[PDB]
Amino acid sequence: GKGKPRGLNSARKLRVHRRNNRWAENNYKKRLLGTAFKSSPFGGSSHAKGIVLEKLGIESKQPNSAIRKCVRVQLIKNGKKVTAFVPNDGCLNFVDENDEVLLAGFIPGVRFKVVKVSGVSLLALWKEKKEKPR
Amino acid sequence: ARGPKKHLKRLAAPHHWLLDKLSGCYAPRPSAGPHKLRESLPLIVFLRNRLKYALNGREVKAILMQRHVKVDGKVRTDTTYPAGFMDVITLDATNENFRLVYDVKGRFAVHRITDEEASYKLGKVKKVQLGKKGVPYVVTHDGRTIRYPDPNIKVNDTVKIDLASGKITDFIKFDAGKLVYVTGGRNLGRIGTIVHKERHDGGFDLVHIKDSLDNTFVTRLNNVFVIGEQGKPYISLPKGKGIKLSIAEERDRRRAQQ
Amino acid sequence: ILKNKGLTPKRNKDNRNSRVKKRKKYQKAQKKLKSV
Amino acid sequence: PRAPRTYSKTYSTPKRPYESSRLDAELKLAGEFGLKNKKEIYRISFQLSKIRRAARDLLTRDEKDPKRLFEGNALIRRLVRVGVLSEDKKKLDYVLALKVEDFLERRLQTQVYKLGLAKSVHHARVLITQRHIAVGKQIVNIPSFMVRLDSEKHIDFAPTSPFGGARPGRVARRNAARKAE
Amino acid sequence: YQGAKLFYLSGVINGRYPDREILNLSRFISVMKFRPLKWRNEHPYMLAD
Amino acid sequence: VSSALFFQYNQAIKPPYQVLIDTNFINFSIQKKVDIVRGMMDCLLAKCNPLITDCVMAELEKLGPKYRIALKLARDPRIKRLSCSHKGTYADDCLVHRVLQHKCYIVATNDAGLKQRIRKIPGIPLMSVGGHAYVIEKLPDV
Amino acid sequence: ERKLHVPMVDRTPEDDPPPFIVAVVGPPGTGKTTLIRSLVRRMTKSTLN
RNA sequence: GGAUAGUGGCCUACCAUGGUUUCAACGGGUAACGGGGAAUAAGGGUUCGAUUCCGGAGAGGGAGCCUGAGAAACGGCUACCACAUCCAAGGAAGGCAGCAGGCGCGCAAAUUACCCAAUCCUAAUUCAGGGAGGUAGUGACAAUAAAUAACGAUACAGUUGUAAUUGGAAUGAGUACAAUGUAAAUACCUUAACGAGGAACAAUUGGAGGGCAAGUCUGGUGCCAGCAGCCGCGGUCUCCAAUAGCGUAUAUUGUUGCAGUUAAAAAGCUCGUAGUUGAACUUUGGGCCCGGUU
RNA sequence: GUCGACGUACUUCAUAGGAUCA
Ligand SMILES: [Mg+2]
Ligand SMILES: [Mg+2]
Ligand SMILES: [Mg+2]
Ligand SMILES: [Mg+2]
Ligand SMILES: [Mg+2]
Ligand SMILES: [Mg+2]
Ligand SMILES: [Mg+2]
Ligand SMILES: [Mg+2]
Ligand SMILES: [Mg+2]
Ligand SMILES: [Mg+2]
Ligand SMILES: [Mg+2]
Ligand SMILES: [Mg+2]
Ligand SMILES: [Mg+2]
Ligand SMILES: [Mg+2]
Ligand SMILES: [Mg+2]
Ligand SMILES: [Mg+2]
Ligand SMILES: [Mg+2]
Ligand SMILES: [Mg+2]
Ligand SMILES: [Zn+2]
């Protein structure tokens, strides 16, 4: 005996035992209860819109440093302040205060990067293929 | 739905019609008639997709309105008239007569017949009952009501109906050793001899049928149609004589004839 | 203005057709094998 | 609406695209047979995998099993017809022993090279895509065309081709006209 | 922007474009809505009539 | 360098394949209920001609009654026998000496050390058993 | 998520807003004058010569 | 008994006290239309299925009906609830979850196109009608095949590599007589005549690694090291992967077969209902006959 | 109120061992 019923007519005890024990899994619990998106950085979304409050590392002396590429952004969905990466200081010129920035998951502690500014791809602006509409 | 349906999607149409699945979206819905919907071949499919006389539905309508097509000796003009099993289709201009018989594969086969054999048909007696004024009558599988039958005629027997008068010429009793034709199920189109009838009161009767190759199969009684005595069919049978052939033997025969 | 290719890195002509690039790579591989 | 039209993928990414040995083998195959990209090799690998899986499944069945006999005979017939499988090797065991290179061999590009019409496999591909090669009485412009045993003997320059007896191409008559002027 | 509406005019008859697409253009303008812009919402301006 | 090797690609090992069986391979086949012949035909989709050398056989006979099952499976007539011309009865050294000598064999083993030392040698497909069935490592034709 | 934007103030009056300025811009001879004539006829049923 | 097309607590009147349930009733949740099917997996299993077919329900939300064989119909009617159009203010007319096309934001995506020529459907009916349906147009949905060069000579550099070197042969992207195609067109397949050397008829998406200065910043066991370097006195580069496709972000329990002394988990002990499970025994053996396979 | 408990989500600390050589 393994501590589990084995009789040919004991199907029900096995099913009811399984259904009760399946809730132990954190993955299972999150999936059915729809709580798997609390841990998501954006609260379930793949991208986040934000307002550029300030360019923190604008005054850093060393060019192209990690600090120079960080911007403090307000998430419009909830108003929480977060920090985002820009691909390079050259791209930082495009970003200025009080524009919409679309953020995506990525100086430890910075977990976001800017992918679109003012509704235009930041990569496109860097490649000189578009103009930022103001 | 709020009433009878009037459309038939191509995918939902009977398989044995062999309709192209990409030619269109709809298929001919057989109108109400002697035969059931799923067990009938509308004249449009017969004239266009089998004989290839007409290229499209409009030409089929042109043919029918000319009154060249006769079903069972009567002119029909409905494109979707449900012709079916044991119905005689006469095209006088072509001097052609056809009897609709399932081939071994289970599909209606273009079988050409002589005029004399076209003069009659066979019908399975579905019902024997007294009508009004005490007049006995028989209802066959094609919905023909024939009054004053021979008293010995009982249900499941076969009656040879002359198309000109619509009267019974002769009849065959359903008995062991009789030649029968399968008209439903996976054994559709096969021919054999009765061996034994299992009876189950309040249930579906079963009939054991032995083929000429001595292979045996069991079929529900509703799908059996007596067509004559062994070796003496009352109608001309299509090619293959209702013998089911294995895939390997079919390959061998095909390679040989080619 | 028309193509709007912007700034892109300089790319060798062989990239334009993969077949030619693979041909050249295979020939170079045979030459290197002759040394091995 | 109209009934669906079936579609399918003719290739699948390998389990391990990043194996160095696999990269080297792909390089060798592409160079030897002048293949444009890795998609062709993946396609042929997918087909060969399908045939070999079917051969395994048929072998699993008992011998004389009617499905085994019929399907094995059909598969061996097809493989022999397409030329991959030789006449003397008509057994499912030898079907299971096939390799990708055999399928690449039957490609019309390789056959056109071998018969002597082209000086390179790449020249054969260019000739094919330029409508110079005809199988039988028919022009074929597809390098991946798989040549059957019967059709291998009928590969030739197309009648309409300048190399097949037609008039000179645009360049030739253009230069001739300029010289005449 | 991607998907921007672009209207097509074929020819000129009697110094007028075809009626049908002018209907399309007229309806499109009618239901149009305009964004709030920083400059135009912070200064007063007037086009001389 | 062996002429059967194109860079890291062995252009000699073609179906039907020749496969050397290591001692530990048999148990992990037994623990997983994987038939030796069908297991290989399944992983590689080819006919495989199993080969067992004397040294591995000598190891198996030494094991004792506990491993009688592996022994009789080892003596299956479908398993061909390889003669050994070297004194040492160690199996790992014998196998690698064979693959070094001629580049046609698949090595069937699960020993990490032997697997690593095979991995260093080029053009030697390495096969193992894990999970539910066999796995082939360095074989492009798959 | 795409519904979110930077908050802004629109100063357009609640009642009796001004007519919207439509600028017809294009290279010379492209048909600016005729387009204006075609539109004004539709909206007002009168043609401005 | 009434009603129903008809059986029936379907409803009425009188009667009895019954009906379901730990073998889970009743109640609650359901980002629940059901199925054929789709994905994955070695097998067991796990998930998806509004969506080409079948069946059910609905036409903004409830309620109720005429007609007719067939409707509780909504591109039929009537009220109420909510919206909302015209108005001379007395009144009138509404239902796109049909095809196009709009709004729902201040951030966005198929044409208010052509035809009944094929499919079949409706009618008094061969003919009329059919946004059902077909045809074409339009974001690389998902899929197939497949161009962007091939063969030579010369030159330069350490028998290999490099050409804004050089020769005459081939060809379709595109343009276009014509014809085919189609209801009429477009397109495809054909094809006169044009259409290639930077073949400028100018293939892309990612990653990796350099080197340079009278240049700039920072730190120090001198001349150095780190960061990095579109900026200097004047003056207006290499390689790797995929390939007509490529990148980024989020998401993505053990029946077979788990464990419970020492690092998840054995209840303080016993009794005990449901549930699961539960010792052995009843015609075995023997002697002949027939026809089948390998 | 930089309050308590719980739930949820994350961060963090505990990795070296044998042999040879100098
Ligand atoms: Mg025990
Ligand atoms: Mg009954
Ligand atoms: Mg030509
Ligand atoms: Mg003007
Ligand atoms: Mg719902
Ligand atoms: Mg569902
Ligand atoms: Mg569904
Ligand atoms: Mg309804
Ligand atoms: Mg609505
Ligand atoms: Mg209603
Ligand atoms: Mg309706
Ligand atoms: Mg409507
Ligand atoms: Mg609509
Ligand atoms: Mg549509
Ligand atoms: Mg009349
Ligand atoms: Mg085109
Ligand atoms: Mg009990
Ligand atoms: Mg017992
Ligand atoms: Zn040995």
JSON list of N, CA and C (backbone and C1' of nucleotides) in Angstrom, two decimals, chain I:
[
{"chain": "I", "resi": 1, "resn": "G", "atom": "P", "xyz": [-1.56, 61.98, 7.97]},
{"chain": "I", "resi": 1, "resn": "G", "atom": "O5'", "xyz": [-1.39, 61.30, 9.40]},
{"chain": "I", "resi": 1, "resn": "G", "atom": "C5'", "xyz": [-0.31, 60.40, 9.64]},
{"chain": "I", "resi": 1, "resn": "G", "atom": "C4'", "xyz": [-0.31, 59.89, 11.06]},
{"chain": "I", "resi": 1, "resn": "G", "atom": "C3'", "xyz": [0.80, 58.89, 11.37]},
{"chain": "I", "resi": 1, "resn": "G", "atom": "O3'", "xyz": [1.23, 59.03, 12.73]},
{"chain": "I", "resi": 1, "resn": "G", "atom": "C1'", "xyz": [-1.30, 57.86, 11.69]},
{"chain": "I", "resi": 2, "resn": "U", "atom": "P", "xyz": [2.63, 58.39, 13.19]},
{"chain": "I", "resi": 2, "resn": "U", "atom": "O5'", "xyz": [2.77, 57.10, 12.26]},
{"chain": "I", "resi": 2, "resn": "U", "atom": "C5'", "xyz": [4.03, 56.66, 11.80]},
{"chain": "I", "resi": 2, "resn": "U", "atom": "C4'", "xyz": [4.10, 56.63, 10.30]},
{"chain": "I", "resi": 2, "resn": "U", "atom": "C3'", "xyz": [4.39, 55.29, 9.66]},
{"chain": "I", "resi": 2, "resn": "U", "atom": "O3'", "xyz": [3.22, 54.50, 9.53]},
{"chain": "I", "resi": 2, "resn": "U", "atom": "C1'", "xyz": [5.66, 57.01, 8.60]},
{"chain": "I", "resi": 3, "resn": "C", "atom": "P", "xyz": [3.29, 52.90, 9.46]},
{"chain": "I", "resi": 3, "resn": "C", "atom": "O5'", "xyz": [2.42, 52.44, 10.71]},
{"chain": "I", "resi": 3, "resn": "C", "atom": "C5'", "xyz": [2.72, 52.91, 12.01]},
{"chain": "I", "resi": 3, "resn": "C", "atom": "C4'", "xyz": [1.90, 52.22, 13.06]},
{"chain": "I", "resi": 3, "resn": "C", "atom": "C3'", "xyz": [1.61, 50.75, 12.82]},
{"chain": "I", "resi": 3, "resn": "C", "atom": "O3'", "xyz": [2.70, 49.91, 13.17]},
{"chain": "I", "resi": 3, "resn": "C", "atom": "C1'", "xyz": [-0.38, 51.84, 13.44]},
{"chain": "I", "resi": 4, "resn": "G", "atom": "P", "xyz": [3.03, 48.61, 12.29]},
{"chain": "I", "resi": 4, "resn": "G", "atom": "O5'", "xyz": [2.07, 47.50, 12.90]},
{"chain": "I", "resi": 4, "resn": "G", "atom": "C5'", "xyz": [2.19, 47.11, 14.26]},
{"chain": "I", "resi": 4, "resn": "G", "atom": "C4'", "xyz": [1.11, 46.15, 14.66]},
{"chain": "I", "resi": 4, "resn": "G", "atom": "C3'", "xyz": [0.94, 44.94, 13.77]},
{"chain": "I", "resi": 4, "resn": "G", "atom": "O3'", "xyz": [1.88, 43.92, 14.04]},
{"chain": "I", "resi": 4, "resn": "G", "atom": "C1'", "xyz": [-1.18, 45.89, 14.21]},
{"chain": "I", "resi": 5, "resn": "A", "atom": "P", "xyz": [2.44, 43.00, 12.85]},
{"chain": "I", "resi": 5, "resn": "A", "atom": "O5'", "xyz": [1.24, 42.00, 12.55]},
{"chain": "I", "resi": 5, "resn": "A", "atom": "C5'", "xyz": [0.72, 41.18, 13.59]},
{"chain": "I", "resi": 5, "resn": "A", "atom": "C4'", "xyz": [-0.58, 40.54, 13.19]},
{"chain": "I", "resi": 5, "resn": "A", "atom": "C3'", "xyz": [-0.58, 39.79, 11.86]},
{"chain": "I", "resi": 5, "resn": "A", "atom": "O3'", "xyz": [0.00, 38.50, 11.96]},
{"chain": "I", "resi": 5, "resn": "A", "atom": "C1'", "xyz": [-2.49, 41.16, 11.99]},
{"chain": "I", "resi": 6, "resn": "C", "atom": "P", "xyz": [0.93, 37.95, 10.77]},
{"chain": "I", "resi": 6, "resn": "C", "atom": "O5'", "xyz": [-0.10, 37.60, 9.61]},
{"chain": "I", "resi": 6, "resn": "C", "atom": "C5'", "xyz": [-1.08, 36.60, 9.79]},
{"chain": "I", "resi": 6, "resn": "C", "atom": "C4'", "xyz": [-2.23, 36.75, 8.82]},
{"chain": "I", "resi": 6, "resn": "C", "atom": "C3'", "xyz": [-1.90, 36.56, 7.36]},
{"chain": "I", "resi": 6, "resn": "C", "atom": "O3'", "xyz": [-1.83, 35.19, 6.98]},
{"chain": "I", "resi": 6, "resn": "C", "atom": "C1'", "xyz": [-3.23, 38.49, 7.62]},
{"chain": "I", "resi": 7, "resn": "G", "atom": "P", "xyz": [-0.85, 34.73, 5.79]},
{"chain": "I", "resi": 7, "resn": "G", "atom": "O5'", "xyz": [-1.50, 35.36, 4.49]},
{"chain": "I", "resi": 7, "resn": "G", "atom": "C5'", "xyz": [-2.76, 34.91, 4.01]},
{"chain": "I", "resi": 7, "resn": "G", "atom": "C4'", "xyz": [-3.24, 35.72, 2.84]},
{"chain": "I", "resi": 7, "resn": "G", "atom": "C3'", "xyz": [-2.28, 35.83, 1.67]},
{"chain": "I", "resi": 7, "resn": "G", "atom": "O3'", "xyz": [-2.30, 34.69, 0.83]},
{"chain": "I", "resi": 7, "resn": "G", "atom": "C1'", "xyz": [-3.16, 37.96, 2.17]},
{"chain": "I", "resi": 8, "resn": "U", "atom": "P", "xyz": [-0.97, 34.22, 0.07]},
{"chain": "I", "resi": 8, "resn": "U", "atom": "O5'", "xyz": [-0.69, 35.41, -0.96]},
{"chain": "I", "resi": 8, "resn": "U", "atom": "C5'", "xyz": [-1.63, 35.72, -1.97]},
{"chain": "I", "resi": 8, "resn": "U", "atom": "C4'", "xyz": [-1.26, 36.98, -2.70]},
{"chain": "I", "resi": 8, "resn": "U", "atom": "C3'", "xyz": [0.15, 37.03, -3.26]},
{"chain": "I", "resi": 8, "resn": "U", "atom": "O3'", "xyz": [0.27, 36.33, -4.49]},
{"chain": "I", "resi": 8, "resn": "U", "atom": "C1'", "xyz": [-0.31, 39.05, -2.14]},
{"chain": "I", "resi": 9, "resn": "A", "atom": "P", "xyz": [1.64, 35.58, -4.86]},
{"chain": "I", "resi": 9, "resn": "A", "atom": "O5'", "xyz": [2.64, 36.77, -5.20]},
{"chain": "I", "resi": 9, "resn": "A", "atom": "C5'", "xyz": [2.32, 37.72, -6.21]},
{"chain": "I", "resi": 9, "resn": "A", "atom": "C4'", "xyz": [3.30, 38.86, -6.24]},
{"chain": "I", "resi": 9, "resn": "A", "atom": "C3'", "xyz": [4.77, 38.47, -6.18]},
{"chain": "I", "resi": 9, "resn": "A", "atom": "O3'", "xyz": [5.27, 38.03, -7.43]},
{"chain": "I", "resi": 9, "resn": "A", "atom": "C1'", "xyz": [4.36, 40.29, -4.73]},
{"chain": "I", "resi": 10, "resn": "C", "atom": "P", "xyz": [6.62, 37.17, -7.49]},
{"chain": "I", "resi": 10, "resn": "C", "atom": "O5'", "xyz": [7.69, 38.09, -6.76]},
{"chain": "I", "resi": 10, "resn": "C", "atom": "C5'", "xyz": [8.87, 38.51, -7.43]},
{"chain": "I", "resi": 10, "resn": "C", "atom": "C4'", "xyz": [9.44, 39.76, -6.82]},
{"chain": "I", "resi": 10, "resn": "C", "atom": "C3'", "xyz": [10.80, 39.61, -6.16]},
{"chain": "I", "resi": 10, "resn": "C", "atom": "O3'", "xyz": [11.87, 39.60, -7.10]},
{"chain": "I", "resi": 10, "resn": "C", "atom": "C1'", "xyz": [9.38, 40.80, -4.71]},
{"chain": "I", "resi": 11, "resn": "U", "atom": "P", "xyz": [13.11, 38.60, -6.90]},
{"chain": "I", "resi": 11, "resn": "U", "atom": "O5'", "xyz": [14.06, 39.37, -5.89]},
{"chain": "I", "resi": 11, "resn": "U", "atom": "C5'", "xyz": [14.53, 40.67, -6.21]},
{"chain": "I", "resi": 11, "resn": "U", "atom": "C4'", "xyz": [15.08, 41.37, -4.99]},
{"chain": "I", "resi": 11, "resn": "U", "atom": "C3'", "xyz": [16.22, 40.66, -4.28]},
{"chain": "I", "resi": 11, "resn": "U", "atom": "O3'", "xyz": [17.47, 40.86, -4.91]},
{"chain": "I", "resi": 11, "resn": "U", "atom": "C1'", "xyz": [14.64, 41.40, -2.69]},
{"chain": "I", "resi": 12, "resn": "U", "atom": "P", "xyz": [18.51, 39.65, -5.05]},
{"chain": "I", "resi": 12, "resn": "U", "atom": "O5'", "xyz": [19.08, 39.47, -3.58]},
{"chain": "I", "resi": 12, "resn": "U", "atom": "C5'", "xyz": [19.70, 40.55, -2.90]},
{"chain": "I", "resi": 12, "resn": "U", "atom": "C4'", "xyz": [19.78, 40.31, -1.42]},
{"chain": "I", "resi": 12, "resn": "U", "atom": "C3'", "xyz": [20.46, 39.01, -1.01]},
{"chain": "I", "resi": 12, "resn": "U", "atom": "O3'", "xyz": [21.87, 39.12, -1.01]},
{"chain": "I", "resi": 12, "resn": "U", "atom": "C1'", "xyz": [18.46, 39.30, 0.22]},
{"chain": "I", "resi": 13, "resn": "C", "atom": "P", "xyz": [22.79, 37.86, -1.39]},
{"chain": "I", "resi": 13, "resn": "C", "atom": "O5'", "xyz": [23.87, 37.77, -0.21]},
{"chain": "I", "resi": 13, "resn": "C", "atom": "C5'", "xyz": [23.65, 38.38, 1.06]},
{"chain": "I", "resi": 13, "resn": "C", "atom": "C4'", "xyz": [23.74, 37.38, 2.18]},
{"chain": "I", "resi": 13, "resn": "C", "atom": "C3'", "xyz": [24.24, 35.99, 1.81]},
{"chain": "I", "resi": 13, "resn": "C", "atom": "O3'", "xyz": [25.65, 35.94, 1.72]},
{"chain": "I", "resi": 13, "resn": "C", "atom": "C1'", "xyz": [22.32, 35.81, 3.20]},
{"chain": "I", "resi": 14, "resn": "A", "atom": "P", "xyz": [26.38, 34.79, 0.88]},
{"chain": "I", "resi": 14, "resn": "A", "atom": "O5'", "xyz": [27.17, 33.96, 1.98]},
{"chain": "I", "resi": 14, "resn": "A", "atom": "C5'", "xyz": [27.22, 32.54, 1.94]},
{"chain": "I", "resi": 14, "resn": "A", "atom": "C4'", "xyz": [26.43, 31.93, 3.06]},
{"chain": "I", "resi": 14, "resn": "A", "atom": "C3'", "xyz": [26.20, 30.43, 2.99]},
{"chain": "I", "resi": 14, "resn": "A", "atom": "O3'", "xyz": [27.30, 29.68, 3.47]},
{"chain": "I", "resi": 14, "resn": "A", "atom": "C1'", "xyz": [24.16, 31.53, 3.50]},
{"chain": "I", "resi": 15, "resn": "U", "atom": "P", "xyz": [28.49, 29.22, 2.50]},
{"chain": "I", "resi": 15, "resn": "U", "atom": "O5'", "xyz": [27.80, 29.03, 1.08]},
{"chain": "I", "resi": 15, "resn": "U", "atom": "C5'", "xyz": [28.36, 29.63, -0.09]},
{"chain": "I", "resi": 15, "resn": "U", "atom": "C4'", "xyz": [29.46, 28.79, -0.67]},
{"chain": "I", "resi": 15, "resn": "U", "atom": "C3'", "xyz": [30.00, 29.27, -2.02]},
{"chain": "I", "resi": 15, "resn": "U", "atom": "O3'", "xyz": [31.38, 28.94, -2.13]},
{"chain": "I", "resi": 15, "resn": "U", "atom": "C1'", "xyz": [29.16, 27.10, -2.26]},
{"chain": "I", "resi": 16, "resn": "A", "atom": "P", "xyz": [32.52, 29.92, -1.57]},
{"chain": "I", "resi": 16, "resn": "A", "atom": "O5'", "xyz": [33.86, 29.08, -1.74]},
{"chain": "I", "resi": 16, "resn": "A", "atom": "C5'", "xyz": [34.29, 28.17, -0.74]},
{"chain": "I", "resi": 16, "resn": "A", "atom": "C4'", "xyz": [33.60, 26.84, -0.83]},
{"chain": "I", "resi": 16, "resn": "A", "atom": "C3'", "xyz": [34.50, 25.62, -0.86]},
{"chain": "I", "resi": 16, "resn": "A", "atom": "O3'", "xyz": [34.97, 25.26, 0.43]},
{"chain": "I", "resi": 16, "resn": "A", "atom": "C1'", "xyz": [32.84, 25.40, -2.53]},
{"chain": "I", "resi": 17, "resn": "G", "atom": "P", "xyz": [36.48, 24.74, 0.61]},
{"chain": "I", "resi": 17, "resn": "G", "atom": "O5'", "xyz": [36.44, 23.25, 0.06]},
{"chain": "I", "resi": 17, "resn": "G", "atom": "C5'", "xyz": [35.62, 22.28, 0.70]},
{"chain": "I", "resi": 17, "resn": "G", "atom": "C4'", "xyz": [35.60, 20.98, -0.06]},
{"chain": "I", "resi": 17, "resn": "G", "atom": "C3'", "xyz": [36.95, 20.37, -0.42]},
{"chain": "I", "resi": 17, "resn": "G", "atom": "O3'", "xyz": [37.54, 19.68, 0.66]},
{"chain": "I", "resi": 17, "resn": "G", "atom": "C1'", "xyz": [35.46, 20.22, -2.27]},
{"chain": "I", "resi": 18, "resn": "G", "atom": "P", "xyz": [39.14, 19.57, 0.77]},
{"chain": "I", "resi": 18, "resn": "G", "atom": "O5'", "xyz": [39.54, 18.53, -0.36]},
{"chain": "I", "resi": 18, "resn": "G", "atom": "C5'", "xyz": [39.67, 17.15, -0.06]},
{"chain": "I", "resi": 18, "resn": "G", "atom": "C4'", "xyz": [40.01, 16.34, -1.29]},
{"chain": "I", "resi": 18, "resn": "G", "atom": "C3'", "xyz": [41.44, 16.46, -1.79]},
{"chain": "I", "resi": 18, "resn": "G", "atom": "O3'", "xyz": [42.34, 15.63, -1.07]},
{"chain": "I", "resi": 18, "resn": "G", "atom": "C1'", "xyz": [39.93, 16.63, -3.61]},
{"chain": "I", "resi": 19, "resn": "A", "atom": "P", "xyz": [43.89, 16.03, -0.96]},
{"chain": "I", "resi": 19, "resn": "A", "atom": "O5'", "xyz": [44.43, 15.86, -2.45]},
{"chain": "I", "resi": 19, "resn": "A", "atom": "C5'", "xyz": [44.55, 14.58, -3.04]},
{"chain": "I", "resi": 19, "resn": "A", "atom": "C4'", "xyz": [45.17, 14.66, -4.41]},
{"chain": "I", "resi": 19, "resn": "A", "atom": "C3'", "xyz": [46.42, 15.52, -4.52]},
{"chain": "I", "resi": 19, "resn": "A", "atom": "O3'", "xyz": [47.59, 14.86, -4.08]},
{"chain": "I", "resi": 19, "resn": "A", "atom": "C1'", "xyz": [44.94, 16.06, -6.28]},
{"chain": "I", "resi": 20, "resn": "U", "atom": "P", "xyz": [48.81, 15.71, -3.46]},
{"chain": "I", "resi": 20, "resn": "U", "atom": "O5'", "xyz": [49.50, 16.37, -4.73]},
{"chain": "I", "resi": 20, "resn": "U", "atom": "C5'", "xyz": [49.97, 15.57, -5.80]},
{"chain": "I", "resi": 20, "resn": "U", "atom": "C4'", "xyz": [50.26, 16.40, -7.03]},
{"chain": "I", "resi": 20, "resn": "U", "atom": "C3'", "xyz": [51.20, 17.58, -6.83]},
{"chain": "I", "resi": 20, "resn": "U", "atom": "O3'", "xyz": [52.57, 17.20, -6.80]},
{"chain": "I", "resi": 20, "resn": "U", "atom": "C1'", "xyz": [49.32, 18.27, -8.07]},
{"chain": "I", "resi": 21, "resn": "C", "atom": "P", "xyz": [53.60, 18.00, -5.85]},
{"chain": "I", "resi": 21, "resn": "C", "atom": "O5'", "xyz": [53.80, 19.39, -6.60]},
{"chain": "I", "resi": 21, "resn": "C", "atom": "C5'", "xyz": [54.37, 19.45, -7.89]},
{"chain": "I", "resi": 21, "resn": "C", "atom": "C4'", "xyz": [54.15, 20.79, -8.54]},
{"chain": "I", "resi": 21, "resn": "C", "atom": "C3'", "xyz": [54.73, 21.99, -7.81]},
{"chain": "I", "resi": 21, "resn": "C", "atom": "O3'", "xyz": [56.11, 22.17, -8.05]},
{"chain": "I", "resi": 21, "resn": "C", "atom": "C1'", "xyz": [52.51, 22.46, -8.47]},
{"chain": "I", "resi": 22, "resn": "A", "atom": "P", "xyz": [57.04, 22.85, -6.94]},
{"chain": "I", "resi": 22, "resn": "A", "atom": "O5'", "xyz": [56.57, 24.37, -6.92]},
{"chain": "I", "resi": 22, "resn": "A", "atom": "C5'", "xyz": [56.78, 25.22, -8.05]},
{"chain": "I", "resi": 22, "resn": "A", "atom": "C4'", "xyz": [56.52, 26.67, -7.71]},
{"chain": "I", "resi": 22, "resn": "A", "atom": "C3'", "xyz": [57.42, 27.26, -6.64]},
{"chain": "I", "resi": 22, "resn": "A", "atom": "O3'", "xyz": [57.65, 28.64, -6.91]},
{"chain": "I", "resi": 22, "resn": "A", "atom": "C1'", "xyz": [55.18, 27.35, -5.91]}
]
